[PDB]
From a paper:
Furthermore, we determined the crystal structures of the HLA-A*2601 complexed to four peptides derived from SARS-CoV-2 and human papillomavirus, with one structure of HLA-A*0101 for comparison.
We also determined one structure of HLA-A*0101 in comparison with HLA-A*2601 in detail. For HLA-A*0101, although EVF was not a positive peptide to induce T cell responses in donors tested, when the P3 position changes from F to D, the results of in vitro refolding indicate an increase in the quantity of the HLA-A*0101/EVF complex. Compared with HLA-A*0101, the side chain of Ile97 in HLA-A*0101 is small, creating a deep pocket.
Numbering used by the authors:
A (entry chain B): 0 to 99
B (entry chain A): 1 to 274
C (entry chain M): 1 to 12
The structure:
């Protein structure tokens, strides 16, 4: 039995332009076991329409999932990805930086 | 170019919960085209790319029957492995299986694979000779003896060289408009001061397909690396992929740096200069 | 097209 902590990237499908419809992605990868919680956050509140890809895995057997939601960025709204997993002592929050 | 079909299967036991959770996905190259998810309402093999929808109802009934069968065999194997390892019934455990085949530009079989994992580690794998097995530990040696006695390698070889190739060849034809395209990366380069004296240079590759790509920063032509922050290649969510490479540079010298991009959709590699 | 998981060859 093993444990691997997830890697997290938070980013948009297309280059961000305020007022223009887009997709907000959270990509979690390299984790094991497959049980994971991923929420997308809008000014700290959990976005409800959030879908994910089907569970798949890499050559080393570690899992990956894309979580995503349609959003319209603005210059003041703050977005984030909140991730929990057995290997994380507390939920981990990664803020969306339009520059990565 | 060359092409690949891969199926990925995950069974996760959830004790006292429902039956094990079972998710199966199939890809051609980096394009997903089918899924089966036991926690979905469908209980059927479902399309995930348009060119597979032209498959007739006999296809969807066979793939669905086979996916259910794979689910059932995994359920049984979960209990078997629990016994081999003397693990308690209360813990959750995972079987993962990958298999598939590669063809070259001539459509001929090039590589085939079948590998099985337990709790995130190699369990048993077909070797590249498609005739013998590698067992990762003492428990898998039990399975290896059984599979040698039941001629499993020959059955897997027949599938990998046969129906795996036949299906891959058909999918490539039926979806040539998309599977056999490349989208070259669109490259951005962005400047991010860190102090009066340093700045990050970030080289972006966006909208590219297939996913394999190499991003290198070079100072005066010499491939940086060592201090080049590189992020894992990531899906855009529209079937294309993204990646970036970042290098911290002394303020004033940015114009000496160039970003190098190699991708199969590019006739020549690119060198972009700041 | 997936493989068949119904033979003795699939049982651990």
């Amino acid at each position: 039995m093993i444990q691997r902590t997830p890697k997290i990237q938070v980013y948009s499908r297309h280059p961000a332009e305020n007022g223009k419809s887009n997709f907000l992605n959270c990509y979690v990868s390299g984790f094991h076991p497959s049980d994971i919680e991923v929420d997308l956050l809008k000014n700290g509140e959990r976005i409800e329409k959030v879908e994910h890809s089907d569970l798949s895995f890499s050559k080393d057997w570690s899992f990956y999932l894309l979580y995503y939601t349609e959003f319209t960025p603005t210059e003041k709204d703050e977005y984030a990805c909140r991730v929990n997993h057995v290997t994380l002592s507390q939920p981990k929050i990664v803020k969306w930086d339009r520059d990565m | 170019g060359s092409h690949s079909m891969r199926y990925f299967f995950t069974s996760v036991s959830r004790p006292g919960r429902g039956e094990p959770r079972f998710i199966a996905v199939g890809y051609v190259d980096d394009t997903q085209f089918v899924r089966f998810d036991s926690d979905a309402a469908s209980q059927k093999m479902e399309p995930r790319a348009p060119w597979i929808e032209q498959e007739g109802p006999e296809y969807w009934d066979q793939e669905t029957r086979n996916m259910k069968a794979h689910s059932q065999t995994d359920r049984a194997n979960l209990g078997t492995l629990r016994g081999y390892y003397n693990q308690s019934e209360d813990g959750s455990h995972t079987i993962q299986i990958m298999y598939g085949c590669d063809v070259g530009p001539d459509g001929r079989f090039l590589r085939g694979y079948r590998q099985d994992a337990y709790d995130g580690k190699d369990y048993i794998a077909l070797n590249e000779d498609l005739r013998s097995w590698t067992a990762a530990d003492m428990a898998a040696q039990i399975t290896k003896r059984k599979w040698e006695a039941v001629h499993a390698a020959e059955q897997r070889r027949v599938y990998l060289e046969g129906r795996c190739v036949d299906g891959l060849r058909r999918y490539l034809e039926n979806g040539k408009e998309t599977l056999q395209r490349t989208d070259p990366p669109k490259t951005h380069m962005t400047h991010h001061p860190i102090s009066d004296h340093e700045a990050t240079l970030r080289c972006w590759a966006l909208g590219f397909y297939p996913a394999e790509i190499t991003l290198t920063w070079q100072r005066d032509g010499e491939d940086q690396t060592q201090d080049t922050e590189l992020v894992e290649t990531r899906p855009a969510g529209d079937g294309t992929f993204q990646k970036w490479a970042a290098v911290v540079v002394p303020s004033g010298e940015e114009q000496r740096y160039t970003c190098h991009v190699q991708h199969e959709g590019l006739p020549k590699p690119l060198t972009l200069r700041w | 097209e997936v493989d068949n998981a119904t033979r003795f060859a699939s049982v651990y």
